[PDB]
Design a protein around this ligand. Structure first.
Ligand SMILES: [Zn+2]
Length: 380
């Protein structure tokens, strides 16, 4: 196959010892990608040819969860094809690999000096520390950021990888990958993103994709859609209702301490539990989960049974860690393998829904508060 790298991939020269730090990063990236591919293709549940993914947590017609074999989505098949191409010719793919040591597009971080010391690669890359970043921010957002990032290793290690992976893709098994990939406090500065604690308590990182360490534009002329990485969300937070054009895949790593520690919702935008009004080339979706009505909509996440979900375009979703033993645990959260399948078409923006009662209630958003989601049409 012929690989074309993204535009911001600038060939570079490494010293002998530098090249060893890049190679360990690269080898664990390949393991991660290979395990990702096996997780897509290995049959689970009642699916014969690929993994069984949740696609709606509440189907309005059956009143039950709704499911699909994930490789039936053409975009997922293409991700699998391009991962196979990478794994078959890794020296060619490596030309598109960059540790992002001096990456200009925006700041990338390492949680803490403790995480930085898990690998010589991370120490050499020497990203800014999130512990420093949140100490400067201060306030309730900083307090949450410090809690998450000072305990990042313990939170991201509380994972059970033995059921749907054949290798430990967590920070314990791939410490160079997890300590060296660029972590992003994506909501720390977003005044629309719900509570202060959720904002300081959220992180994601990208291994492969238009902003990852592996940045392939095209393989054999096909636009590479795959965007693959990981997320960490601190316990006792609620990720507000949100949606976007690109399809999305989540694989739950966290082993929960109660069945309902980590709840998620995924609902198709035209699900009859919501109210939809056509807007200008879009839809206004009103969500009313008040007075207990939201509970039907949320399902528990765990790394054995309910480990995999697939989000069709503009599907409304939420990640909720307020219930149950979230009022009792510490140094915990929700950690996942995260991916999108169509990162190079349509609008990549993660859209946040807004409270029906206006901006005054952003900081208390949770599944029971009424919300409005302003969806936009996407291109066929
Ligand atoms: Zn999403």
């Amino acid at each position: 196959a012929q690989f074309q790298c993204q535009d911001d991939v600038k060939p570079t020269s490494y010293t002998t010892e530098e090249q060893k730090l890049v190679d360990q990063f690269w080898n664990e990236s390949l393991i991660y990608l290979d395990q990702y591919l096996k997780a897509l293709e290995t049959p689970t549940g009642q699916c014969k040819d690929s993994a069984q993914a949740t696609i709606q947590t509440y189907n309005s017609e059956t009143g039950k969860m709704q499911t699909q074999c994930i490789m039936k989505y053409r975009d997922v098949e293409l991700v699998a094809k391009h991962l196979k191409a990478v794994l078959a010719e890794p020296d060619k793919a490596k030309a598109c690999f960059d540790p992002q040591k001096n990456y200009k597009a925006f700041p990338l971080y390492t949680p803490s000096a403790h995480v930085q010391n898990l690998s010589a690669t991370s120490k050499w890359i020497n990203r800014p520390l999130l512990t420093d970043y949140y100490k400067k921010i201060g306030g309730e957002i900083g307090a949450a950021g410090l809690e998450l990032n000072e305990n990042f290793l313990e939170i991201t290690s509380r994972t059970d990888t033995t059921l749907h992976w054949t290798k430990d893709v967590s920070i314990k098994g791939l410490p160079t990958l997890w300590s060296s990939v660029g972590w992003i406090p994506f909501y720390a500065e977003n005044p629309n993103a719900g509570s202060d604690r959720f904002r300081g308590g959220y992180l994601y990182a990208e291994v492969m994709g238009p902003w990852g360490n592996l940045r392939i534009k095209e393989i054999d002329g096909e636009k590479v859609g795959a965007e693959i990485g990981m997320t960490a969300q601190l316990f006792n937070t609620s990720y507000p209702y949100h949606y976007h054009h690109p399809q999305e895949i989540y694989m739950t790593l966290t082993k929960p301490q109660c069945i309902d520690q980590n709840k998620h919702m995924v609902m198709h935008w035209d699900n009859n539990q919501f109210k939809q009004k056509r807007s200008d080339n879009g839809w206004t979706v009103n969500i009313d989960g008040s007075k207990g009505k939201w509970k039907k909509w949320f399902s528990n996440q765990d790394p054995e049974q309910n480990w995999l979900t697939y989000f069709e375009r503009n599907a409304i979703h939420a990640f909720h860690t307020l219930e149950g033993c979230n009022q009792t645990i510490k140094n915990s959260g929700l950690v996942t393998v995260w991916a999108r399948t169509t990162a190079q078409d349509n609008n990549q923006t993660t859209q946040l829904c807004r409270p029906m009662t206006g901006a005054k209630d952003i900081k208390t958003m949770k599944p029971e508060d009424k919300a409005i989601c302003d969806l936009d049409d996407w291109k066929p």
